[PDB]
Coordinates of all heavy atoms in Angstrom, one line a residue:
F759 N 313.2 -11.8 140.7 CA 312.1 -12.7 140.8 C 310.8 -11.9 141.0 O 309.7 -12.2 140.4 CB 312.3 -13.7 142.0 CG 313.1 -14.8 141.7 CD1 314.4 -15.1 142.3 CD2 312.8 -15.8 140.7 CE1 315.2 -16.2 142.0 CE2 313.5 -16.9 140.4 CZ 314.7 -17.1 141.0
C760 N 310.8 -10.9 141.9 CA 309.6 -10.2 142.3 C 309.0 -9.5 141.0 O 307.8 -9.5 140.8 CB 309.9 -9.2 143.4 SG 310.0 -9.9 145.0
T761 N 309.9 -8.9 140.2 CA 309.5 -8.2 139.0 C 308.8 -9.2 138.0 O 307.8 -8.9 137.4 CB 310.7 -7.4 138.3 OG1 311.4 -6.7 139.3 CG2 310.1 -6.5 137.3
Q762 N 309.5 -10.4 137.9 CA 308.9 -11.4 137.0 C 307.5 -11.8 137.4 O 306.6 -11.8 136.6 CB 309.8 -12.6 136.9 CG 311.1 -12.4 136.2 CD 311.9 -13.7 136.0 OE1 312.4 -14.2 137.0 NE2 312.0 -14.2 134.8
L763 N 307.3 -12.0 138.7 CA 306.0 -12.5 139.2 C 305.0 -11.4 139.0 O 303.8 -11.6 138.6 CB 306.1 -12.9 140.7 CG 307.2 -13.9 140.9 CD1 307.4 -14.1 142.4 CD2 306.8 -15.2 140.3
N764 N 305.4 -10.1 139.4 CA 304.4 -9.0 139.2 C 304.0 -8.8 137.8 O 302.8 -8.6 137.5 CB 305.0 -7.7 139.8 CG 304.9 -7.7 141.3 OD1 305.9 -7.6 142.0 ND2 303.7 -7.7 141.8
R765 N 305.0 -8.9 136.9 CA 304.7 -8.8 135.4 C 303.7 -9.9 135.0 O 302.8 -9.6 134.2 CB 305.9 -8.8 134.6 CG 305.7 -8.3 133.2 CD 307.0 -8.2 132.4 NE 307.9 -7.2 133.0 CZ 309.1 -7.5 133.4 NH1 309.7 -8.6 133.3 NH2 309.8 -6.4 133.9
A766 N 304.0 -11.1 135.4 CA 303.1 -12.2 135.0 C 301.7 -12.0 135.5 O 300.7 -12.2 134.7 CB 303.6 -13.5 135.5
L767 N 301.6 -11.6 136.7 CA 300.2 -11.4 137.3 C 299.5 -10.2 136.7 O 298.3 -10.3 136.5 CB 300.3 -11.2 138.8 CG 300.6 -12.6 139.5 CD1 300.9 -12.4 141.0 CD2 299.5 -13.5 139.3
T768 N 300.2 -9.2 136.4 CA 299.6 -8.0 135.6 C 299.1 -8.5 134.3 O 298.1 -8.0 133.8 CB 300.6 -6.9 135.6 OG1 301.8 -7.3 135.0 CG2 300.8 -6.2 136.9
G769 N 299.9 -9.3 133.6 CA 299.5 -9.8 132.3 C 298.2 -10.6 132.4 O 297.3 -10.5 131.6
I770 N 298.1 -11.4 133.4 CA 296.9 -12.2 133.7 C 295.7 -11.3 133.9 O 294.8 -11.4 133.2 CB 297.1 -13.1 135.0 CG1 298.3 -14.1 134.8 CG2 295.9 -13.7 135.4 CD1 298.0 -15.0 133.6
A771 N 295.9 -10.2 134.7 CA 294.8 -9.4 135.0 C 294.4 -8.7 133.8 O 293.1 -8.4 133.6 CB 295.2 -8.3 136.1
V772 N 295.3 -8.2 132.9 CA 294.9 -7.6 131.6 C 294.1 -8.6 130.8 O 293.1 -8.2 130.2 CB 296.1 -7.1 130.9 CG1 295.8 -6.6 129.5 CG2 296.8 -6.0 131.7
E773 N 294.6 -9.8 130.7 CA 294.0 -10.7 129.7 C 292.6 -11.1 130.1 O 291.7 -11.3 129.2 CB 294.8 -11.9 129.4 CG 295.2 -12.8 130.6 CD 296.3 -13.8 130.4 OE1 296.1 -14.8 129.7 OE2 297.5 -13.4 130.8
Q774 N 292.2 -11.2 131.4 CA 290.8 -11.6 131.7 C 289.9 -10.4 131.2 O 288.8 -10.7 130.5 CB 290.5 -11.8 133.2 CG 291.0 -13.2 133.7 CD 292.3 -13.1 134.2 OE1 292.9 -12.1 134.6 NE2 293.0 -14.3 134.3
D775 N 290.2 -9.2 131.5 CA 289.3 -8.1 131.0 C 289.3 -8.1 129.5 O 288.2 -7.7 128.9 CB 289.6 -6.8 131.6 CG 290.8 -6.0 130.9 OD1 291.3 -6.4 129.9 OD2 291.0 -4.9 131.4
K776 N 290.4 -8.4 128.9 CA 290.4 -8.6 127.4 C 289.4 -9.6 126.9 O 288.6 -9.4 126.0 CB 291.8 -8.8 126.9 CG 291.8 -9.2 125.4 CD 291.1 -8.1 124.5 CE 291.7 -6.7 124.7 NZ 291.4 -5.9 123.5
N777 N 289.4 -10.7 127.7 CA 288.4 -11.8 127.4 C 287.0 -11.2 127.5 O 286.1 -11.5 126.6 CB 288.5 -13.0 128.3 CG 289.8 -13.7 128.2 OD1 290.6 -13.7 129.1 ND2 290.0 -14.3 127.0
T778 N 286.7 -10.5 128.5 CA 285.3 -10.0 128.7 C 284.9 -9.0 127.6 O 283.9 -9.2 127.0 CB 285.2 -9.2 130.0 OG1 285.3 -10.2 131.1 CG2 283.9 -8.5 130.2
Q779 N 285.8 -8.1 127.3 CA 285.5 -7.1 126.2 C 285.3 -7.8 124.9 O 284.5 -7.4 124.0 CB 286.6 -6.1 126.1 CG 286.7 -5.2 127.2 CD 287.9 -4.1 127.0 OE1 288.6 -4.2 126.0 NE2 288.0 -3.2 128.0
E780 N 286.1 -8.9 124.6 CA 285.9 -9.6 123.4 C 284.6 -10.4 123.3 O 283.9 -10.4 122.2 CB 287.1 -10.6 123.2 CG 287.5 -10.9 121.7 CD 286.5 -11.7 121.0 OE1 285.9 -12.6 121.6 OE2 286.3 -11.5 119.8
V781 N 284.3 -11.1 124.4 CA 283.1 -12.0 124.3 C 281.8 -11.1 124.3 O 280.8 -11.5 123.7 CB 283.1 -13.0 125.4 CG1 283.1 -12.3 126.8 CG2 282.0 -14.0 125.2
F782 N 281.8 -10.0 125.1 CA 280.6 -9.2 125.2 C 280.4 -8.2 124.1 O 279.4 -8.2 123.3 CB 280.5 -8.6 126.6 CG 280.1 -9.5 127.7 CD1 280.9 -9.8 128.7 CD2 278.8 -10.0 127.7 CE1 280.5 -10.7 129.7 CE2 278.4 -10.9 128.7 CZ 279.3 -11.2 129.7
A783 N 281.4 -7.2 124.0 CA 281.3 -6.0 123.2 C 281.6 -6.4 121.8 O 282.8 -6.3 121.3 CB 282.2 -4.9 123.8
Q784 N 280.6 -6.8 121.0 CA 280.8 -7.1 119.6 C 280.1 -6.1 118.7 O 280.3 -6.1 117.5 CB 280.3 -8.5 119.3 CG 281.4 -9.6 119.6 CD 281.1 -10.9 119.0 OE1 280.0 -11.1 118.5 NE2 282.1 -11.8 119.0
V785 N 279.2 -5.3 119.2 CA 278.4 -4.3 118.4 C 278.6 -3.0 119.1 O 278.4 -2.9 120.4 CB 276.9 -4.7 118.2 CG1 276.9 -5.9 117.4 CG2 276.3 -4.9 119.6
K786 N 278.9 -1.9 118.4 CA 279.1 -0.6 118.9 C 277.9 0.3 118.7 O 278.1 1.5 118.4 CB 280.4 0.0 118.4 CG 281.7 -0.8 118.7 CD 282.0 -0.7 120.1 CE 281.5 -1.9 120.9 NZ 282.0 -1.9 122.4
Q787 N 276.7 -0.2 118.8 CA 275.5 0.6 118.7 C 274.6 0.0 119.8 O 273.9 -0.9 119.6 CB 274.9 0.5 117.3 CG 275.6 1.4 116.3 CD 275.0 2.7 116.2 OE1 274.2 3.2 117.0 NE2 275.3 3.4 115.0
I788 N 274.5 0.7 121.0 CA 273.7 0.3 122.1 C 272.2 0.5 121.7 O 271.8 1.6 121.5 CB 274.0 1.0 123.4 CG1 275.5 1.0 123.6 CG2 273.3 0.3 124.5 CD1 276.1 -0.4 124.0
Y789 N 271.5 -0.6 121.3 CA 270.1 -0.5 120.9 C 269.2 -0.3 122.1 O 269.5 -0.7 123.3 CB 269.7 -1.7 120.1 CG 270.4 -1.8 118.8 CD1 271.5 -2.6 118.6 CD2 269.9 -1.2 117.7 CE1 272.2 -2.6 117.4 CE2 270.5 -1.2 116.5 CZ 271.7 -2.0 116.3 OH 272.3 -2.1 115.2
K790 N 268.1 0.3 121.9 CA 267.1 0.7 122.9 C 266.0 -0.3 122.8 O 265.5 -0.5 121.6 CB 266.6 2.1 122.8 CG 267.6 3.2 123.0 CD 268.1 3.2 124.4 CE 267.0 3.7 125.3 NZ 266.5 5.0 125.0
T791 N 265.6 -0.9 123.9 CA 264.5 -1.9 123.9 C 263.2 -1.2 123.5 O 262.8 -0.2 124.2 CB 264.3 -2.5 125.3 OG1 265.5 -3.4 125.5 CG2 263.1 -3.3 125.4
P792 N 262.5 -1.6 122.5 CA 261.2 -1.0 122.2 C 260.1 -1.5 123.1 O 260.2 -2.6 123.6 CB 261.0 -1.6 120.7 CG 261.6 -2.9 120.7 CD 262.8 -2.8 121.6

């Protein structure tokens, strides 16, 4: 049971940061403000 719960929570933790990287980082050229 403990292993199942830990794996589920780790998957949760991974997927939120995946959401962040997907929604924000869409261009790989950090432009400089003129």
Side-chain angles (χ1 to χ4, degrees):
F759 277 119
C760 285
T761 314
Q762 287 186 293
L763 307 171
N764 281 119
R765 191 175 299 124
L767 287 173
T768 51
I770 297 299
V772 172
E773 58 197 280
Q774 286 89 21
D775 83 1
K776 172 51 58 157
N777 296 115
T778 291
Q779 292 181 356
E780 209 290 325
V781 63
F782 280 115
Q784 276 194 349
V785 295
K786 299 289 95 176
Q787 284 266 17
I788 313 290
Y789 291 95
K790 295 292 292 298
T791 290

